[PDB]
Amino acid sequence: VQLNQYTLKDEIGKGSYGVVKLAYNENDNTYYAMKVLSKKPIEQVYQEIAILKKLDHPNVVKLVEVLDDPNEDHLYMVFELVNQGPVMEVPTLKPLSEDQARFYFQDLIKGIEYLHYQKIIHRDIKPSNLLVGEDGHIKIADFGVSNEFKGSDALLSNTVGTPAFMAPESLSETRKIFSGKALDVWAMGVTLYCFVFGQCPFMDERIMCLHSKIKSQALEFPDQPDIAEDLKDLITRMLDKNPESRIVVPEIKLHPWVTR
Ligand SMILES: Cn1cc(/C=C2\C(=O)Nc3ccc(Cl)cc32)cn1
Ligand SMILES: [Cl-]
Numbered sequence: 001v002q003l004n005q006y007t008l009k010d011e012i013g014k015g016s017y018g019v020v021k022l023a024y025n026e027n028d029n030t031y032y033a034m035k036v037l038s039k040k041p042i043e044q045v046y047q048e049i050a051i052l053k054k055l056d057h058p059n060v061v062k063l064v065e066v067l068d069d070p071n072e073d074h075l076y077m078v079f080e081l082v083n084q085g086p087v088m089e090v091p092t093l094k095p096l097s098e099d100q101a102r103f104y105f106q107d108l109i110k111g112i113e114y115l116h117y118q119k120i121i122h123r124d125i126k127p128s129n130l131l132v133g134e135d136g137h138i139k140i141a142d143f144g145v146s147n148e149f150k151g152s153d154a155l156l157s158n159t160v161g162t163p164a165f166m167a168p169e170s171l172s173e174t175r176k177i178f179s180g181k182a183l184d185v186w187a188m189g190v191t192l193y194c195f196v197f198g199q200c201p202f203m204d205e206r207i208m209c210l211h212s213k214i215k216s217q218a219l220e221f222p223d224q225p226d227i228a229e230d231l232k233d234l235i236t237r238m239l240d241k242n243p244e245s246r247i248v249v250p251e252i253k254l255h256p257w258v259t260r
Pocket of ligand 1: 012013014015016020033035061079080081082083084085086131141142143
């Protein structure tokens, strides 16, 4: 299976809409990550390509090129390979230590700050989208449902992303408008909870009940593992159900748990 200079190898991950395969470039003798898409909507993908083309940051995955044939049903996005894969799998019985969670969370902060400055809402922040590169640092991946905005913030109404990480204000049943940056903060909070507990803070196999818990269940910390009180404070502020009082990224950067 060869596509121009690339030989397609085995699957390595899930992308938004498609699959991600390891790929070998015969021109430069180098492995890449290739997202394969079958046209089944397509406007969302070219916005993703358009977003990826504008981005250049150490904590954000790089799009290398796009293989688009108006003849073939398949479309190929070639990314840099982030060789060590996701930072963790959720759920797990072996979560990160606090020191590891802080190390990775610092990369997540820098990446999100950059995305928001570039006027991008990621909308699908979660551990499986935080890939560990050759030097051990995080690269944010999967911009399949991301939004670009003008001005100070996005004003959104559509519900997209991974359900366990969706912010409560995005789950109104009345097409209400909500702002974008606070959505990424909420998902960063679910992610940090995942880092140290190995499972999501709101869980239910019934999607109605999952939504109801995100919107209405008080955050609860498990007795074990016993995490520091300032980390509990930071998670609590990021998982504030009210997006208006939810901690903002400039404050996360200063939080005493982050800076120690
Ligand atoms: C070792 N490993 C790599 C992956 C996946 C990816 C990778 O490397 N670059 C990517 C760029 C964009 C997307 Cl959406 C996914 C990946 C999974 N496991
Ligand atoms: Cl995940």
